[PDB]
Structure 1
Amino acid sequence: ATLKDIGVSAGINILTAFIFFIIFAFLRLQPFNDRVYFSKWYLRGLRSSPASGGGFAGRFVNLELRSYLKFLHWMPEALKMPERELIDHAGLDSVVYLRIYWLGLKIFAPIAMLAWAVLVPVNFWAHIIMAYAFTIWTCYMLMKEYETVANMRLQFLASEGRRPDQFTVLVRNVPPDPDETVSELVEHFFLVNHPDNYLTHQVVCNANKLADLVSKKTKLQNWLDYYQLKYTRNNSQIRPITKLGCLGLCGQKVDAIEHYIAEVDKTSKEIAEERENVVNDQKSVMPASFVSFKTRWAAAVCAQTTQTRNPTEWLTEWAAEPRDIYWPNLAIPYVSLTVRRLVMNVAFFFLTFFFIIPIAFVQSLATIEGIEKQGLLAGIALKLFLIFLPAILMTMSKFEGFTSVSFLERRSASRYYIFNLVNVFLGSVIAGAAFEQLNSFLNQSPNQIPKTIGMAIPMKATAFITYIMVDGWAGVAGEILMLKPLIIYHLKNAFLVKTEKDREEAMNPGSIGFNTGEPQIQLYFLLGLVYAPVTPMLLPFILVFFALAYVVYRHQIINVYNQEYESAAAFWPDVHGRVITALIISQLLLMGLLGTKHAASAAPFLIALPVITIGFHRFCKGRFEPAFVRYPLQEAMMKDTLERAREPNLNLKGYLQDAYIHPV
C-alpha cells in the first residue's frame, strides 16, 4: 500500500495499457477488423471499404511494423481534427462529451499543482485554504465550461439545416372529446390558440405492435438466415426453445430454415393484420400529436408556454429529433407518469442498497450449478449485475415515461451516478454492505456522518489509486481495442451475412454511451475533489485517466462511434450538477476529516464552503441552464428571418408532415 507498491502496480497497468495499444495497432492494420475500427468513416461514406478499399493486405503478412509509433501514432492523429470539424463530423454531443475529460484536466491539473506546492510540502489551516481554492477553481471552470457549452449549443442550433424539431412541438395528454378525434382536437386547438403560425400536425398512433411485428419479421428471417443460406434445400433447421430464444437444436421446433419459413410468412400476415388495426381504426391514435409551426419562434413559444387551465393537459414540449423520439413512451398519461416515477424512485432505493441480498441468491444458485458438471465460475454474482446495471437503469427510465432517447440516457446516467456514489465510493470508504452503511448513517449524528467517512478517506486512498489504474487506465485502453464489437461483427459477417451489396452492416458500435461513460467520468471527478485537500497523490492518477480517456474517446468519436441522436449538448446541466455534487461531498468530508483529527476552529470556514457552492450552482441554473432547455425567442426569430430571406419559398408543410410518423 506504499508508494513502492503503488508504483509497481502503476507500471503494471501502464504496461497493460501499452499491450492493449499494441494489439490495437495490430488489428487496425488488418482489413477484417477495419469495418469495426473505422465504422463512422463508412457511416459517413468517407471511407470506401474496410482497408480504405477493402479486403486488402497489411494484415498478418507484415504483422505490425515493430516500432514505438505503431501504437502511439493514433494519439496525435486523434487530436489533429479541429473541434469544429468534429462538430460536423460526429456531433456537438460527442464534442462536449470530450469536453468533460478536458474539464477534468482543466480542474484537477491546476489543483494538483496547488496541492503539490502547498499540501504535500506541509504534510491544518493550509488544508482549508487549499479546499477553498480548489472549490473556487472548480466553480470557475464549471462556469466557464457552462458558458462555452451554451455558446456551442446556440451556435449549433443557429447553423442547423432546417431540423424538423425546431418547428415542431410534442403536445401530450390531449383531452378526449366525445365527437372530435385527437386529430381534430389538435387542429382546432392550435388554430385558435396559435392561429398565425399553426402549420400542420402529426397525431401519434400506437404503432408499437406494428413495429414489433415488422422487426420480428426481419428478426426471424435473419434468425436462421445463416442456416438458410448455408446450402439451401434442407439445412440445419435449429430449434431455439421459446423461453429465451437463443439456444438452437435444443427444443422441438425443427421444421425448416429462415425460422421455419411458414412462421416468418405468418409474421407477415400478422403485420398486415396489425396494419389494419393501427391505420384504419382511430383507437390506436394516442392522445398526443406533433404540432408543427411555420416559424421556430412560434414553436418555441408553444413549447415554453402553458396552453390550457389544466397544466397537465395539452402538454406542449419542444419535440425531440425524429430519431430521438422514443415512440413507446408517448402513450403515458400524466397521472400514470407521476406514479411510474415514484415507483421507480423507490425501486431505485432498493436497487442501490438492498441489491446484494438478491445477488447472493443468484450466487447460491451459481454454487448449485457449480456442483452440476474448468468450472470455478469466477465473477457471476455482482460482476454480471454490474454489467447489466446500465441496462436495468435504462429500463427504469423507460418505465418512468421519458419520450426521448436522450432523456432516457440522461436519467440512466443520473441513476448510475447515485448507484456508484453509494456502492463504489461509499462502498470502499465504509466496510459495510450498502444497506449496512445506510443503517449506520441513519443511526449516526448529522455531524458524525461526515466525520466517519471523512476519517475513512485518507486510509484507503491507495485502494482508489488502484481503481484509477485499473478501471480508468486499462479500462480506457481496452475501449480503444474495441474487442467486443470486433467479435460481434466477426460472428455476423461469417454467420448471417446474406447481403446483396453492403446491407448487413453491424459495423456501427453505437454512440459514446452517456448513460454509462459519463457516470464513470463523474466518479473520478468526485475522487479527485474528495482527495485533493486530503491526499494530493490521487490527482496524478486521475489526470492520467483524463488525458488518456480524452485521446482514446476522441479517436473513437472520430473513427468508430456514431451518434444515434443529437441533443445539441442538452445534457450539460446534468454534468454540471454532478460536479457540484462532487464539490459539496468533498467539502462535507473535509469538514469531517478536520472534525476528527481537528476540533472546530476551521469548521466555521468549511461550513461556509457548501453554501457558496450551492449559491454558485443556483446562479448557474439561472444563467446558463435555461439555454439548454428552451429556445431563446430572439435566437429563433433570427434564424427564421435569415432563412426566410435565403429561401422565401420553402413549403415547410410537406417537410414537417412525414417527419413524425412511426413505422409507416
Structure 2
Amino acid sequence: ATLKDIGVSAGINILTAFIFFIIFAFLRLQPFNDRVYFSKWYLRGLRSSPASGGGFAGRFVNLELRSYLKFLHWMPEALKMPERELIDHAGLDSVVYLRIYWLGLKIFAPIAMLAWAVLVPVNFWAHIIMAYAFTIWTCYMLMKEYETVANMRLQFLASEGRRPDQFTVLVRNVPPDPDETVSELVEHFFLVNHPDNYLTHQVVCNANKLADLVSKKTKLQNWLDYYQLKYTRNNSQIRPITKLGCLGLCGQKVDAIEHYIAEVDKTSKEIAEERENVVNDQKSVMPASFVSFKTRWAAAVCAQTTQTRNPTEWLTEWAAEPRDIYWPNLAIPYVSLTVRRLVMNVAFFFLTFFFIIPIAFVQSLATIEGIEKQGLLAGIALKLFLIFLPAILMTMSKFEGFTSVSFLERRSASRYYIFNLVNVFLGSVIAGAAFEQLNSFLNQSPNQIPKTIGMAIPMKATAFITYIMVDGWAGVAGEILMLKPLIIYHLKNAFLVKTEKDREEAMNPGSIGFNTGEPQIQLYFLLGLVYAPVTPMLLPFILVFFALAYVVYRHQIINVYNQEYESAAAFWPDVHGRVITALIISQLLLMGLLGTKHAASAAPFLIALPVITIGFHRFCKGRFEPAFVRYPLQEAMMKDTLERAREPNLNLKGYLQDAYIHPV
C-alpha cells in the first residue's frame, strides 16, 4: 500500500508491457505472422501476400534489430495517419472509439494538474471547489466531443456511398390478417400510407434452422478435413463424443473421415428439406419486413413517424446495414422481447454476483505475487474472466433480441458498465468477500443500511492502482501482441486449410470490440472521476492507460482490426451518458464524503452539482443526441437530390430488393 510497493508493482507491469512489446516486435517481423498482424491491409487490398509479397525473411535470422525502435517504432507510426484518412481506412466507428481515449486524456490531464496543485500540496472546502471544477471541465469536454462526433457523423452520413439501409426501414409487429399474407399486408400498408415514395419490401423469414444447417454442413465438411487430407485413404478417425463435441479419440464414433462424410451428406439432405419448408410455406414469414423507399427522405419520414394508432404495431425503425443485421433475432416475436429483457435483467443480477468474487480473488492473487516478487500469470487469469464476461453479456443481449450487431455490442457494453459499477461500489467488497460480507449483506442486524454500506463503500484507491497497472497497462500491451488470432490461424493454415489459393483466410481479427474495450475505458473514467476530488493518486495511472491504449488501439485499428459494421458513431450517446453517470456517482460520493467531514455548510453546493450535471446532460441530449438517432430530413433530401443529379438514371429497386434477404 506504500508508494514503495506501488512503484515496485508499477515497475513489474511496465516491464511486462515492454516484454509484450518486445515479443510483438519479433513476431511482427516474422513474415509468416504478418497475415495476422497487418490484416486490415490485406482486407483493403493494399498489401499482397503476408510479407508484402510473401515468403521472405525478417524472421529469426535477424531476430529483432538490437535497439529501442525495434519495439517502439510502431508507436509514432500509429500516430501518423491523419484522422480523416483513418475514417476512410477503417471507419468512423473506430475513429470515434479512439476519440474516447483522447477524451480521457483531455479530461483527466487538466484535472490531474488541478488535483496535484490543491490536494497533495495544500491538504474540506477545497474538495467541493475541486469537484466543481472537475465536473465543469468534464462536462465542457463532453459537450465539445459530442459536437465534434455529431458533426463527423453527419459529414460521414452525407459522404457515405449508397448503402441499402439509407432507403430502408424495419417494420416490426405487422398485425396478422386472416386473408392477407405479411407480404401483402406490408405492401398495401405502405402503398396507401406512404404512396409517393414506397419502392419495394422484403419480408423477414425464419430461416434460422436453415442457417444453422448450412453452418453445420460447413463445420462438418471442415471438421476432420484436416484428417481427411492428412494422408487420405483411412486416417485418424477421431471420436468427439456427442455431448460437447471437441474431444477426439474418446467416444466410439469412427465411421468415415471429414467428420463422417455420411453425416455431412445427411446435413445436406436436411438442408434441402428445410429449404423447401422455409421458402414456400408462409409460416416461416415473420410479422416483420424491410420496407425500402425511393428516397432516403421517405425512409427518414417512415422511421421517425408513427404509422398506426397502436404504437406497438407497424413499428418502423431505420434498418441496419444488411451486414449489421443479426438475422437470428429477427425471428423472435415482439411480445417475447419484453419478457426476454426482464429475464436477462434478473439473470444479470445473478451474473454480477458471479464474477465479482473471482475478480476479487484474482486481484488478491496479483497483490500477493507482486509482494513476493507471476504478474504475467495474474494478468492472464484476470484477462481470462474478462474474456468470458463479454461473451456471457453478448449472449444475454442476443437472448434479449436485438436485431443488429451494433446494438448487441452496445447493450453488452451497457451491461458491462453496470457490472463494473457494482464491482467497484455496492457489491465490491460486500459481494466480493468470500462468505462473510456476502451473507452478512443479506443477513445481518435489523436495518443497518448506511452502516454496512455507507462505511467506505467505494473500495480503496491502492487496490485500484494495481488494477490500472495490470489491466490497463499490461492488458493493452497484450492486445498489441495479438496472441489468440495468431495461434488460431497457425492451427488452421497448417491444419484444416485445403484452400485452392486464398479461401482459407482466418487472418480476420474481428473488430475493436465495443462490448469489451469501451467498458474498460468507462471503468477508468469512473475510477478517475470518483477518486479525483478525494485522492489524486489514481489519475497518473489512469492517464498512462489512456495514452497507451490510444496508441495500441490506433495501431490495431490501422493495421489489424477490421470493422464488421458501420454505425457512424451511433454509440456516442451511450459513451457520453456513461461518463455523465460517473460524474453523478462522483458527486454523490462527495456529498457523502463532505457529509461526514463537515457541517452541511458545503451541502447546498454539493447538491447543486448533480442537478447542474443532469441539466447539462439534458441539454446535450436535446442538442447533439438527435443527430445519432434520427436522420434530419434536410440532410436526407440533400443527399437524394445530389445523387439524383450525379446519376439521373438509377434503378434503386434492383439495389434495394434483394439487399435484405437472409444470407442463406
TM-score normalized with structure 2 length: 0.94
The 3 A distance-change label for structure 1 pair 648 and 458 is closer
The 3 A distance-change label for structure 1 pair 448 and 401 is same
The 3 A distance-change label for structure 1 pair 448 and 544 is farther
CA distance in 2, matches of 1:530, 1:290: 45
Question: How far off is 1:98 after superposition?
Answer: 0.4
CA distance in 2, matches of 1:266, 1:332: 28
Question: How far off is 1:320 after superposition?
Answer: 0.3
504-513 or 449-458, which deviates more: 449-458
CA distance in 2, matches of 1:139, 1:518: 19
The 3 A distance-change label for structure 1 pair 351 and 629 is same
The 3 A distance-change label for structure 1 pair 244 and 39 is same
Query: What secondary structure does 2:379 align onto?
Result: coil
CA distance in 2, matches of 1:594, 1:460: 17
| % identity of equivalent residues | 100
CA distance in 2, matches of 1:365, 1:421: 22
Question: How far off is 1:387 after superposition?
Answer: 3.3
The 3 A distance-change label for structure 1 pair 40 and 70 is same
442-451 or 589-598, which deviates more: 442-451
The 3 A distance-change label for structure 1 pair 507 and 379 is closer
The 3 A distance-change label for structure 1 pair 467 and 357 is closer
CA distance in 2, matches of 1:130, 1:613: 15
80-89 or 458-467, which deviates more: 458-467
The 3 A distance-change label for structure 1 pair 345 and 434 is farther
Question: How far off is 1:266 after superposition?
Answer: 1.2
Any conservation in 2 of the 1:40–1:560 contact (CA below 8 Å)?
Answer: yes
Question: How far off is 1:597 after superposition?
Answer: 2.8
CA distance in 1, matches of 2:371, 2:465: 37
The 3 A distance-change label for structure 1 pair 432 and 278 is closer
Query: What secondary structure does 1:465 align onto?
Result: helix
Any conservation in 2 of the 1:205–1:284 contact (CA below 8 Å)?
Answer: yes
Any conservation in 2 of the 1:448–1:592 contact (CA below 8 Å)?
Answer: no
CA distances 1:605-641 after superposition (whole Å, capped 9, x unpaired): 1111111111111111111111111111111111111
Query: What secondary structure does 1:217 align onto?
Result: helix
Query: What secondary structure does 1:596 align onto?
Result: coil
CA distances 1:573-617 after superposition (whole Å, capped 9, x unpaired): 110111011111111111222223333221221111111111111
Any conservation in 2 of the 1:237–1:255 contact (CA below 8 Å)?
Answer: yes
The 3 A distance-change label for structure 1 pair 439 and 299 is farther
Question: How far off is 1:353 after superposition?
Answer: 2.8
Question: How far off is 1:423 after superposition?
Answer: 1.6
The 3 A distance-change label for structure 1 pair 108 and 448 is farther
Question: How far off is 1:373 after superposition?
Answer: 30
Instruction: Name the counterpart of 1:161.
Output: 161
164-173 or 431-440, which deviates more: 431-440
Question: How far off is 1:430 after superposition?
Answer: 5.3
The 3 A distance-change label for structure 1 pair 452 and 99 is farther
Alpha-carbon RMSD across the aligned residues, in angstroms, is 4.3
Any conservation in 1 of the 2:426–2:457 contact (CA below 8 Å)?
Answer: no
Any conservation in 1 of the 2:465–2:541 contact (CA below 8 Å)?
Answer: yes
Any conservation in 2 of the 1:147–1:624 contact (CA below 8 Å)?
Answer: yes
The 3 A distance-change label for structure 1 pair 241 and 575 is same
Question: How far off is 1:358 after superposition?
Answer: 11
CA distances 1:287-329 after superposition (whole Å, capped 9, x unpaired): 1110000000000000011111111111111000100001111
CA distance in 2, matches of 1:65, 1:371: 34
Any conservation in 2 of the 1:109–1:543 contact (CA below 8 Å)?
Answer: yes
The 3 A distance-change label for structure 1 pair 259 and 88 is same
Any conservation in 1 of the 2:362–2:378 contact (CA below 8 Å)?
Answer: no
Instruction: Name the counterpart of 1:491.
Output: 491
CA distances 1:155-186 after superposition (whole Å, capped 9, x unpaired): 11000100110000001111111111111111
TM-score normalized with structure 1 length: 0.94
The 3 A distance-change label for structure 1 pair 367 and 242 is farther
Any conservation in 2 of the 1:207–1:663 contact (CA below 8 Å)?
Answer: no
426-435 or 171-180, which deviates more: 426-435
Query: What secondary structure does 1:70 align onto?
Result: coil
Question: How far off is 1:337 after superposition?
Answer: 1.3
CA distance in 2, matches of 1:367, 1:429: 16
CA distance in 2, matches of 1:531, 1:371: 24
Instruction: Name the counterpart of 2:3.
Output: 3
The 3 A distance-change label for structure 1 pair 366 and 97 is closer
Any conservation in 1 of the 2:422–2:428 contact (CA below 8 Å)?
Answer: no
Any conservation in 2 of the 1:39–1:559 contact (CA below 8 Å)?
Answer: yes
590-599 or 58-67, which deviates more: 590-599
Any conservation in 2 of the 1:573–1:628 contact (CA below 8 Å)?
Answer: yes
CA distance in 1, matches of 2:176, 2:579: 44
CA distances 1:203-261 after superposition (whole Å, capped 9, x unpaired): 11111111111111110000001001111111111111111110111111101111111
Any conservation in 2 of the 1:296–1:636 contact (CA below 8 Å)?
Answer: yes
The 3 A distance-change label for structure 1 pair 530 and 487 is same
Any conservation in 1 of the 2:356–2:432 contact (CA below 8 Å)?
Answer: no
> Where does the alignment leave 5 or more consecutive residues of structure 2 unmatched?
none
Question: How far off is 1:435 after superposition?
Answer: 10
CA distance in 1, matches of 2:50, 2:605: 60
Matches within 5 A, 1:94-133: 94-133=94-133
Question: How far off is 1:416 after superposition?
Answer: 0.7
596-605 or 631-640, which deviates more: 596-605
The 3 A distance-change label for structure 1 pair 636 and 450 is farther
323-332 or 446-455, which deviates more: 446-455
601-610 or 158-167, which deviates more: 601-610
The 3 A distance-change label for structure 1 pair 439 and 191 is farther
91-100 or 459-468, which deviates more: 459-468
Any conservation in 1 of the 2:480–2:552 contact (CA below 8 Å)?
Answer: yes
CA distances 1:105-147 after superposition (whole Å, capped 9, x unpaired): 0000010111112221112111110110000000001111111
CA distances 1:388-423 after superposition (whole Å, capped 9, x unpaired): 211111111111111111111111111111011112
The 3 A distance-change label for structure 1 pair 366 and 24 is closer
The 3 A distance-change label for structure 1 pair 84 and 443 is farther
CA distance in 1, matches of 2:371, 2:147: 59
The 3 A distance-change label for structure 1 pair 221 and 373 is farther
CA distance in 2, matches of 1:584, 1:377: 36
CA distance in 1, matches of 2:352, 2:431: 16
The 3 A distance-change label for structure 1 pair 547 and 571 is same
Question: How far off is 1:523 after superposition?
Answer: 0.3
Question: How far off is 1:457 after superposition?
Answer: 7.2
The 3 A distance-change label for structure 1 pair 220 and 424 is farther
The 3 A distance-change label for structure 1 pair 382 and 27 is closer
Any conservation in 2 of the 1:359–1:381 contact (CA below 8 Å)?
Answer: no
2:562 aligned with 1:559:
no
Query: What secondary structure does 2:10 align onto?
Result: helix
CA distances 1:11-67 after superposition (whole Å, capped 9, x unpaired): 221111111111100100001111111111111111101111112100000011010
Question: How far off is 1:356 after superposition?
Answer: 6.9
Any conservation in 2 of the 1:465–1:538 contact (CA below 8 Å)?
Answer: yes
The 3 A distance-change label for structure 1 pair 76 and 658 is same
The 3 A distance-change label for structure 1 pair 258 and 625 is same
637-646 or 589-598, which deviates more: 589-598
Query: What secondary structure does 1:427 align onto?
Result: coil
Question: How far off is 1:330 after superposition?
Answer: 1.1
CA distances 1:438-459 after superposition (whole Å, capped 9, x unpaired): 8878999999978987763798
Any conservation in 1 of the 2:9–2:370 contact (CA below 8 Å)?
Answer: no
Question: How far off is 1:663 after superposition?
Answer: 2.8
The 3 A distance-change label for structure 1 pair 279 and 434 is farther
The 3 A distance-change label for structure 1 pair 577 and 269 is same
CA distance in 1, matches of 2:630, 2:446: 39
CA distance in 1, matches of 2:201, 2:327: 16
Any conservation in 2 of the 1:458–1:534 contact (CA below 8 Å)?
Answer: no
The 3 A distance-change label for structure 1 pair 174 and 209 is same
Any conservation in 2 of the 1:451–1:592 contact (CA below 8 Å)?
Answer: no
Question: How far off is 1:526 after superposition?
Answer: 0.4
Instruction: Name the counterpart of 1:148.
Output: 148
302-311 or 387-396, which deviates more: 387-396
Any conservation in 1 of the 2:149–2:572 contact (CA below 8 Å)?
Answer: yes
111-120 or 539-548, which deviates more: 111-120
129-138 or 366-375, which deviates more: 366-375
CA distance in 2, matches of 1:380, 1:140: 38
